[PDB]
C-alpha cells in the first residue's frame with residue numbers, strides 16, 4: 001500500500017509551531033491525541049490534502065508544549081485547551097457589533113452575561129497577565145472577540161449555553177489581571193465589641209458583595225457581629241482605578257454621572273437575562289446588539305462599577 005504524508009504544524013498557543021509529518025492513512029487522534037482545527041475537533045478525521053501547511057491545536061502532551069501552554073495561558077488544568085477549543089467552535093460564529101463605540105455580542109447561546117462582562121471591561125482600567133488574555137482582549141477591542149469570549153468560558157469552567165453570573169465571571173478575569181497596587185482599608189464598629197480595621201489587597205480590594213451603592217459603603221453598611229449586634233462596616237481608604245459593588249438583584253435607580261456602568265439581571269436563580277447600562281452623555285442600555293437610551297434608569301441591578309483613584313474617609 002502506497003504511504004502518503006503531508007506536513008502540518010501543531011501548537012498550543014497558535015504562535016510557537018511544531019513541524020509534523022502525518023500519515024494520511026491514520027486519524028489525527030492516532031498521531032497526536034485530541035486535535036483541533038480552528039476549534040473544530042478533527043481527532044477522528046484523517047488528514048485532507050487541503051490540510052497541508054495548516055496549524056492544529058493539540059493538548060500539552062510533551063514538556064515543551066506543557067511550558068508553552070503554561071506561559072501563554074497561566075493554567076495547567078488538563079482539560080483547558082479542549083474546553084477553549086469547544087467554546088471557540090461556537091464563539092467564532094457569534095457576531096460582535098460595535099454598539100455606542102464598544103464591542104458587544106449579538107445574542108446567541110445564552111451569552112448575555114458575556115456581553116455585559118465584555119462591555120464592562122472596555123470601560124475600566126485593567127491589564128491582563130496571561131499573554132492569551134492580553135492578545136485576545138486586544139483583538140476583542142478591535143471587534144474580533146471570538147477568542148476572548150472562548151477564553152472567558154474556559155477560564156470560568158463554563159460551557160457555551162451554561163447559566164453564568166457576572167460577578168463570578170469578573171472575579172475569574174480579575175484573578176488573571178494585575179491588581180497588585182489595589183488597596184482597601186475597612187473599619188467595622190460594634191457598639192459592644194469596639195472597632196476593627198481590615199486591609200484588603202488585589203481582587204478583594206476592588207470587589208464588594210452586599211450593596212450596589214459606593215456612597216452607602218463610604219457612610220456605612222450594617223452587618224452582623226459575632227456578638228449578635230448589628231455592626232457598621234465602612235470604607236476608610238481606597239487605592240484602585242475602579243470599584244465593583246455587587247448585590248442580589250433588586251430594583252435600583254441608576255443616576256446619570258454617578259457611576260461608570262452596571263449589570264441588570266431579570267429572572268430567577270435558574271433562568272434569566274442580563275443587560276448592560278453605561279453612563280455617558282446619557283444612560284445607554286446595551287442588550288447584545290440592541291441599544292436604547294433614557295435620562296433615568298430603574299431595574300433589577302446586580303453590579304455597579306465606579307471610577308476611583310484615591311479615597312480617604314472624613315469619618316473619625
Ligand SMILES: [Cl-]
Pocket residue numbers: 010011012013014015016017065068
Ligand atoms: Cl505551541
Ligand SMILES: [Cl-]
Pocket residue numbers: 126127128129133134137
Ligand atoms: Cl491586557
Ligand SMILES: [Zn+2]
Pocket residue numbers: 190191192193194225226227228229231
Ligand atoms: Zn459585637
